[PDB]
């Protein structure tokens, strides 16, 4: 509590300052960016950089993790008139005022539902502003890139955001119970986003949360297992300005003392409700691990490597019945749409080795995920699809084409891929290669990999390394795609290099203090 | 005294988890071709895994290292045996290395001497069999084979034979950098149809540099370049070459420039010429030479974001603008070939006009130079000199294939040798990563050798630890390319380590990684 209050890193990002752009449709919005001014003699405008760090890097805002972040999104949600306060919330150190919400009976609360109704929500304008990086349409816009048939506009408008969401091609993860959130969008026609994984002291985890988003993590997932992951997660969500994801089966397994066999729908249901009221923005759910797909993995070089996938497979095998997450998929949807939680359909059968890439198991699950996508959309629930994994370079394009076709252009969310298995200790690098390429091919979010992958638990230095690696991978992809806003950054830093403006070069880099130190 | 400094600092002995093994030549029965081998747990019932090993005798317990004497000159006797070279009457003489045991050689007038000349003459040399054996990683030659990859129209065989190697050299599509005066060399091949090689740069105390050489090759550097500037550069380089089992490259203009006291305008042919001969006799295996930076090309760089970033290129640009004359490396190219051919030194045609930023990638100057390199290539071949081509640079991902396409066409499939490329400019201090991305991709598209990049790129001088990070980063990039190309030897390594991860054989997982000590420590 107090041990965290000091250990966490706050203050402006070295070389820059927090700036805000206000909304027009919703005049009270303040959309955050960070700004990097260069030498006056350079005679250039400051450079605007996308910033997921939150109020933590704004000295005007008092931080107190014991109280949580300001709930600056709560008012915009209540004002829509479709949510009511939950009379008696579910209940499980404890986090020390916050009302808990749920859609009114018969009301529609998801971003997808709103978008299909023709409605531009506050979150949507928020995202449109955020995605433009304060660029003005004052100069001609010439595209240099190859985006493989994507529809990235010269300039994002709130109406474009609504169009993308309504068609299922973008999502805004935004539980009505995460009032702290600074809205972001995931989708091919926007900037490539990245995810940081946290989870095994409360301070340590909040710390990694703040550290991860300080350096550019766009979402964070709390992958905690073991004792007291509910209370733990309170501390993270209340103090997070980025979307927070989870794998609900992890906690459900704990309730049944780590026995996959003893898992059931009731425990999983209770867990969902608990996490919905908590403010979790997306759930990874391995509903595509079907009974008959499991024997397809017996011949694999590395079997089933997914944690969530292994758990479901163990249940299916012990009972010899169809995956109950797959079975109750409609009932899962009826819960999530009441709070606007997004689906992240998991790859239980992802390749754990390049030998296993693009095999029958992986693709069978993938095509099943596409089917479930349409069922999710019918209930008005937003979706993204999870991908591999270990994939040699010549198979990465093929991964992307299978997803695009079989999953109806829903956003893709990958773990790497790692492009070779032979370099433990450097897996952030083997995966950065695969991550940059697949993002180029159209992947919307990249889950990070740290050097400790396959070996140990990431400390806050491994977290940073991972985040910086994936930020540069994501940006390399934006640039190759010809994203309208990518090359101003590269050109700014390159003009500084040219003129020997060493300080501007450091301040414009993903990691200014490391660059200055090495110089 | 320097010798104590050196012998104490350098890392020697078995590479953790593996042991030096040799395969004997058959065409040349005295050849001993090195690999390293990693045995896995007996309960796995698997043969040891054979790994390509450029570490040299430093990790061979059968050999007693002694830097004062240099490395075993195991190559001298095969060179001499051909009867095409003779001792130099009066060798050029420039902490000095005790170079008393080494005869210096030069081609006899009218004799064949270069690997390219022998190859075109239908001759299979000791270096050719050596590399063919090496490239096979001790795999079984009489075996059905089916390849899973996409090599974009390469000509990779299921199994490398000495004649395949000869054929590749003769058409100019592969080289073997091997100066007759580098008797310590363990021969290696560079070519699209062989394993992707990597290069580590060192240079700026002698013991500092010899350590980096040993450290670099220990972790998998296939060649090394001594990019030293300033004073003592000839004498330092003695300590490197005599103690290198890998090919050593330089950029001769760096030294030529020092002889004329930093003034690029005072360079001239006489000083360049004398530099070439000195390094030829020293045993330098390849010369990066920026002969494509032509006078009319220089104003094209004016419209660039970062202009001319090549050090060698900038030096030549300065000379040209000052004397208002065509690049003399270009004008006297013929004479340069006649010198190199007499010692079998390979050309590395430098990219003086490479893009220093993604913005300038694939522009007029870059490609104008590339087509010129392509024309110099034919002239070099006419003189019987081996050639590889140097390339970018900073290039965003979507422009990378186009680079390979232009190179293959205009430079007639000669081997390509890239520095990265870096695929974005905004991560100083992580440029080994931004460039690993480009390097793996262009390796996949057919690039033969990848010049590495460390976290210090653009910022500082790499220390011991930066050199290793760069080397490991490029080894995995080069391997990622081999795997994606469907190279017949690549999958075995990845599969072995994946079986170890699956069966929870931690020791084996550690030992089969590019960096065993790190993995064990992280675990
Ligand atoms: O599938 P398992 O349970 O192994 O791993 C879940 C974690 O891996 C991430 N992921 C992303 C794509 N595939 C998997 C997912 O977002 C979460 O961070
Ligand atoms: O062009 P300059 O003189 O800056 O750099 C030459 C170094 O950079 C390497 N290189 C490789 C491809 N392009 C450049 C070349 O092999 C040598 O190692």
Phi, psi of B198 (to 5 degrees): -130, 155
Question: For residue A149, how far is the Cα from the chain centroid?
Answer: 24
Answer yes or no: is B417 a known binding residue: yes
Give the technique used to solve this structure.
Answer: X-ray
CA of B350 to the centre of ligand 2 (A): 6
In chain B, the residue whose alpha carbon lies closest to the alpha carbon of A145 is B398
Q: Are A491 and A150 in contact (CB under 8 A)?
A: no
Give Cα separations from A161 to A129, A167, A230 (angstroms). Answer: 10, 10, 33
d(CA A468, CA A459): 14
Q: Are A255 and A271 in contact (CB under 8 A)?
A: yes
Nearest in space to A197 (alpha carbons), one of A187, A211, A186, A184: A211
Cα end-to-end span (Å), chain A: 38
Which class for A469: exposed (0-12), middle (13-18), buried (19 or more C-beta within 10 A)?
buried
Chain A contact for B447 (CB, 8 A cutoff) = no
Task: Specify the length of chain A in residues.
Answer: 519
Residue owning the nearest CA to atom 15 of ligand 1: A284
d(CA A425, CA B504): 17
The sheet carrying B32-38 orders its strands as: B19-24, B32-38, B49-52
Mutate to test the pocket of ligand 1, among A221, A415, A418, A463 (most ligand atoms within 8 A of CB): A415
Phi, psi of A206 (to 5 degrees): -60, -40
Q: Which residues of A carry a binding-site annotation?
A: 197, 221, 250, 286, 306-308, 347-350, 386, 390, 413, 454
CB contact under 8 A, B485 and A352: no
CB contact under 8 A, B425 and A494: yes
List A residues 283-322 in contact with B (Cβ-Cβ < 8 A): 301-303
Both tokens assigned to A360: 């029958």
The finding on whether A346 has its CB within 6 A of some atom of ligand 1 is yes
DSSP H/E element including A421:
none
What is the maximum alpha-carbon separation in chain A? 72
Give Cα separations from B461 to B24, B223, B436, B453, B467 (angstroms). Answer: 40, 19, 19, 11, 10
Contacts of B149 in chain A (CB under 8 A): 392, 394
Q: Are B512 and B49 in contact (CB under 8 A)?
A: yes
Which class for B21: exposed (0-12), middle (13-18), buried (19 or more C-beta within 10 A)?
middle
Contacts of B476 in chain A (CB under 8 A): 420, 422-423, 426, 429-430
Q: Estimate the crossing angle of helix A360-378 against helix A396-406, to 10 degrees.
A: 30
Both tokens assigned to B296: 């009319």
Task: Specify the length of chain B in residues.
Answer: 523
Chain B contact for A420 (CB, 8 A cutoff) = yes
The finding on whether B310 has its CB within 6 A of some atom of ligand 2 is yes
Place of tokens 């970033």: B309
Q: Which residues of A carry a binding-site annotation for substrate?
A: 197, 221, 250, 286, 306-308, 347-350, 386, 413
Interior angle at CA A496, CA A492 and CA A502, nearest 5: 135
d(CA A119, CA B68): 80
Residue owning the nearest CA to atom 1 of ligand 2: B310
Please tell me what resolution, in angstroms, this structure has: 2.1
Return the CA Rg of chain B: 22
CA of A246 to the centre of ligand 1 (A): 9
Nearest in space to B344 (alpha carbons), one of B384, B299, B376: B384
Residues 6+ apart with CB under 8 A from B188: B54, B131, B134, B176, B177, B197, B222, B223, B246, B247
Helix (H, G, I), strand (E, B) or coil at B314: helix
CA of A29 to the centre of ligand 2 (A): 51
d(CA B379, CA A212): 56
Count of CB atoms within 10 A of residue B347's CB? 29
Q: Which region, left, alpha or beta, applies to residue A359 given φ > 0 means left and ψ of -120 to 50 means alpha?
A: beta
Count of CB atoms within 10 A of residue A79's CB? 12
d(CA B523, CA B521): 5
Burial pattern A488-518, b for ≥16 Cβ within 10 A else e, equals ebbbbbbbbbbeebbebbbbbbbbbebbbeb
The finding on whether B288 has its CB within 6 A of some atom of ligand 2 is yes
The finding on whether B390 has its CB within 6 A of some atom of ligand 2 is yes
What would the DSSP string read from start to end of A388-411?
-SB--GGGHHHHHHHHHHHTTT--
Chain B contact for A475 (CB, 8 A cutoff) = yes
Q: Are A155 and A132 in contact (CB under 8 A)?
A: yes
Task: Detail the DSSP E strand segments found in B375-469.
Answer: 387-391, 416-419, 449-451
Q: Are B305 and B243 in contact (CB under 8 A)?
A: no
Phi, psi of B19 (to 5 degrees): -140, 140
Handedness of CA B486, B487, B488, B493 (dihedral sign): negative
Residues 6+ apart with CB under 8 A from B223: B177, B188, B190, B197, B199, B200, B246, B247, B248, B249, B285, B286, B449
Contacts of A511 in chain B (CB under 8 A): 427-430
| Helix %, strand %, coil % of chain A (to 5) | 40, 10, 45
Ligand 2, atom nearest to B392 Cα? 13
d(CA A143, CA A478): 12
Q: If you ran DSSP here, which 8-state letter would residue A104 be given?
A: P
Which ranges of A248-328 would DSSP assign to H, the alpha helix? Answer: 249-255, 265-278, 307-319, 324-327
What would the DSSP string read from start to end of B138-192?
T--SS------S--SS----SS--HHHHHHHHHTTSEE----TT-TT-----EET
CB contact under 8 A, B494 and A354: yes
| Residues linked to residue B289 through DSSP beta bridges, in sequence order | B349
CA of A344 to the centre of ligand 1 (A): 9
CB contact under 8 A, B440 and A432: no
Could you give all domains of chain B from N- to C-terminal order, each with its CATH number?
1-13+194-488 (3.20.20.540), 14-193 (no CATH), 489-523 (6.10.250.620)
Strands A17-22 and A30-36: antiparallel
Interior angle at CA A519, CA A514 and CA B5, nearest 5: 110
CB contact under 8 A, A392 and B149: yes
Both tokens assigned to A146: 């190859």
Count of CB atoms within 10 A of residue A200's CB? 12
Ligand 1, atom nearest to A388 Cα? 13
Q: Are B351 and B372 in contact (CB under 8 A)?
A: no
Question: For residue B398, how far is the Cα from the chain centroid?
Answer: 26
DSSP H/E element including A197:
strand A193-198
Interior angle at CA A53, CA A47 and CA A58, nearest 5: 80
How far does the CA of residue A507 sit from the closest CA of chain B (Å)? 10
Both tokens assigned to B152: 């974009």
d(CA A374, CA A386): 15
Which class for B349: exposed (0-12), middle (13-18), buried (19 or more C-beta within 10 A)?
buried
Q: Are A135 and A155 in contact (CB under 8 A)?
A: yes
Helix (H, G, I), strand (E, B) or coil at B451: strand
DSSP H/E element including A357:
none
* Ligand lying closest to the C-alpha of residue B312: 2
Half-sphere exposure at residue A106, Cβ-oriented, CA atoms within 13 angstroms: 0
Give Cα separations from B313 to A151, A244, B227, B295, B351 (angstroms). Answer: 41, 51, 14, 11, 7
DSSP H/E element including A414:
strand A412-415
Ligand 2, atom nearest to B390 Cα? 12
CB contact under 8 A, B476 and A437: no
Cα end-to-end span (Å), chain B: 40
Half-sphere exposure at residue B400, Cβ-oriented, CA atoms within 13 angstroms: 30
CB contact under 8 A, B480 and A394: no
Give Cα separations from A385 to A124, A204, A394, A401 (angstroms). Answer: 21, 30, 21, 13
Chain B contact for A258 (CB, 8 A cutoff) = no
d(CA B203, CA B462): 10
Of the candidates B484, B512, B523, which has its C-beta nearest A393's C-beta?
B484
Place of tokens 């004479």: B335
Q: Which region, left, alpha or beta, applies to residue A121 given φ > 0 means left and ψ of -120 to 50 means alpha?
A: beta
């Amino acid at each position: 509590i107090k041990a965290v209050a000091e250990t966490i890193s706050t203050g402006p990002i070295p070389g820059s300052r927090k700036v805000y752009q206000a909304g027009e449709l919703f005049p009270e919005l303040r959309v955050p960016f960070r700004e990097v001014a260069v030498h006056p003699s350079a005679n250039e405008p400051p450079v605007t950089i996308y910033d997921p760090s939150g109020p933590y890097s704004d000295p005007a805002i008092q931080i107190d993790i014991e109280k949580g972040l300001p709930r600056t999104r709560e008012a915009l949600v209540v004002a829509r008139g479709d949510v009511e306060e939950v009379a008696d919330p579910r209940q499980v150190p404890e986090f020390p005022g916050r009302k808990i919400y749920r859609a009114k009976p018969g009301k529609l609360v998801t971003q997808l539902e709103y978008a299909r109704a023709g409605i531009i929500t506050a979150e949507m304008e928020y995202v449109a502003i955020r995605e433009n990086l304060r660029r003005e349409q004052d100069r001609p816009c010439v595209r240099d890139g190859e985006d493989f048939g994507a529809s990235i506009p010269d300039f994002v408008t709130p109406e474009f955001v609504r169009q993308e969401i309504a068609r299922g091609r973008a999502i805004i993860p935004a539980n009505i119970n995460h009032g702290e959130l600074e809205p972001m969008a995931i989708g091919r026609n926007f900037l490539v986003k990245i995810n940081a994984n946290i989870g095994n002291t409360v301070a340590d985890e909040v710390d990694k949360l703040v550290w991860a988003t300080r350096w550019g993590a766009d979402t964070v997932m709390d992958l905690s297992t073991g004792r007291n992951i509910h209370n733990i997660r309170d501390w993270i969500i209340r103090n997070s300005s980025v979307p927070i994801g989870t794998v609900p089966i992890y906690q459900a397994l704990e309730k049944v003392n780590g026995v996959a066999e003893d898992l059931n729908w009731e425990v999983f249901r209770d867990t969902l409700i608990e996490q919905c009221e908590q403010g979790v923005d997306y759930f990874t759910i391995h509903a595509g691990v079907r009974l008959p797909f499991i024997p397809m993995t017996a011949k694999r070089v590395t079997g089933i490597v997914s944690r969530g996938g292994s758990i479901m497979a163990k249940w299916c095998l012990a009972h010899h019945k169809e995956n109950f997450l797959y079975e109750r998929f409609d009932e899962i949807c009826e819960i999530m749409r009441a709070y606007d939680v997004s689906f992240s359909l998991g790859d239980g059968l992802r390749p754990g080795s390049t030998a296993d890439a693009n095999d029958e198991a992986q693709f069978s699950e993938l095509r099943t995920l596409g089917e479930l996508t349409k069922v999710a959309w019918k209930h008005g629930v937003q979706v993204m699809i999870e991908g591999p994994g270990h994939v040699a370079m010549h198979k990465i394009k093929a991964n992307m084409d299978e997803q695009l076709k079989h999953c109806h252009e829903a956003p893709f969310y990958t773990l790497g891929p790692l492009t070779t298995d032979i370099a433990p200790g450097y897996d952030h690098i083997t995966s950065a290669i695969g991550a940059a390429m697949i993002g180029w091919f159209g992947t919307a979010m990249l889950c990070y990999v740290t050097p400790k992958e396959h070996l140990g638990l990431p400390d806050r230095d491994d977290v940073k390394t991972g985040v910086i690696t994936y930020k540069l991978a994501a940006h390399a992809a934006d640039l190759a795609k010809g994203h309208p806003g990518a090359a101003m950054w590269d050109d700014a830093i390159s003009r500084a290099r040219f003129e020997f403006r060493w300080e501007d070069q450091f301040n414009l880099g993903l990691d200014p203090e490391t660059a200055r130190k090495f110089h």
